[PDB]
Amino acid sequence: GTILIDLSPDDKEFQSVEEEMQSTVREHRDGGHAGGIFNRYNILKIQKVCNKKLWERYTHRRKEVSEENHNHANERMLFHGSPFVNAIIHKGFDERHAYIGGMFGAGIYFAENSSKSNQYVYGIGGGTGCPVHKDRSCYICHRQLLFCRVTLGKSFLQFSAAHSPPGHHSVTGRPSVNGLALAEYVIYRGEQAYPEYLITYQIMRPE
Ligand SMILES: Nc1ncnc2c1ncn2[C@@H]1O[C@H](C(=O)N2CCN(CC(=O)Nc3cccc4c3CNC4=O)CC2)[C@@H](O)[C@H]1O
Ligand SMILES: [Zn+2]
């Protein structure tokens, strides 16, 4: 069921998505070890992801969350990086693949910082880098991120240095040390996210 529609760079949606991508880059505490060294991206393509089945599954779960939370879905647009981006656009997010814990347990993780999600494109901690050059800071190979619509509902606030918590629909990882970091979020149901844009890009070598 999935089709990908290419957005023209003149399209206002292309521009607003690119801007969210570029404006949410930050420096990382690993000095670029996992995701490479860059201050900005070269955006090659932005595709709208269209799948009726996945979308209806999302909206159904969204209405359920909403009715449990005074008609407030608490919906965000957030980044997701993964080696399995092709499976996600075709089959949706699936929480059964969330074995190993990150900071907030076995769940599906999303980031406000595009550069944080970029650290996971080639695997946990960047894995071994691009498949062609084995370089976590490769400037040649094309990368992809998803920009996703995520239902947070009532989110458990975790100050920060499986199931949702009882009475909650998600977890929010609030940074409590690094003053420039944006939040990360965790959901425990795959139907609480819809992978709306597929962005293909390169990281750019600083001048
Ligand atoms: N349909 C599917 N087929 C194959 N893999 C699928 C899938 N749906 C989700 N996944 C994948 O399962 C994986 C998963 O849940 N995991 C593995 C990693 N882990 C740590 C984590 O996600 N940290 C983390 C923290 C902050 C941002 C980002 C990430 C990952 N991507 C980001 O943008 C939490 C549990 C994940 O890598 C996801 O992409
Ligand atoms: Zn490469």
UniProtKB/Swiss-Prot annotation:
<comment type="similarity">
    <text>Belongs to the ARTD/PARP family.</text>
</comment>
<feature type="binding site">
    <location>
        <position position="130"/>
    </location>
    <ligand>
        <name>Zn(2+)</name>
    </ligand>
</feature>
<feature type="binding site">
    <location>
        <position position="138"/>
    </location>
    <ligand>
        <name>Zn(2+)</name>
    </ligand>
</feature>
<comment type="subunit">
    <text>Oligomerizes and associates with TNKS. Interacts with the cytoplasmic domain of LNPEP/Otase in SLC2A4/GLUT4-vesicles. Binds to the N-terminus of Grb14 and TRF1 with its ankyrin repeat region. Interacts with HIF1AN. Interacts with RNF146; this interaction leads to ubiquitination and proteasomal degradation. Interacts with NUMA1.</text>
</comment>
<comment type="function">
    <text>Poly-ADP-ribosyltransferase involved in various processes such as Wnt signaling pathway, telomere length and vesicle trafficking. Acts as an activator of the Wnt signaling pathway by mediating poly-ADP-ribosylation of AXIN1 and AXIN2, 2 key components of the beta-catenin destruction complex: poly-ADP-ribosylated target proteins are recognized by RNF146, which mediates their ubiquitination and subsequent degradation. Also mediates poly-ADP-ribosylation of BLZF1 and CASC3, followed by recruitment of RNF146 and subsequent ubiquitination.</text>
</comment>
<feature type="binding site">
    <location>
        <position position="141"/>
    </location>
    <ligand>
        <name>Zn(2+)</name>
    </ligand>
</feature>
<feature type="domain" description="PARP catalytic">
    <location>
        <begin position="8"/>
        <end position="207"/>
    </location>
</feature>
<feature type="binding site">
    <location>
        <position position="133"/>
    </location>
    <ligand>
        <name>Zn(2+)</name>
    </ligand>
</feature>
<protein>
    <recommendedName>
        <fullName>Poly [ADP-ribose] polymerase tankyrase-2</fullName>
    </recommendedName>
</protein>
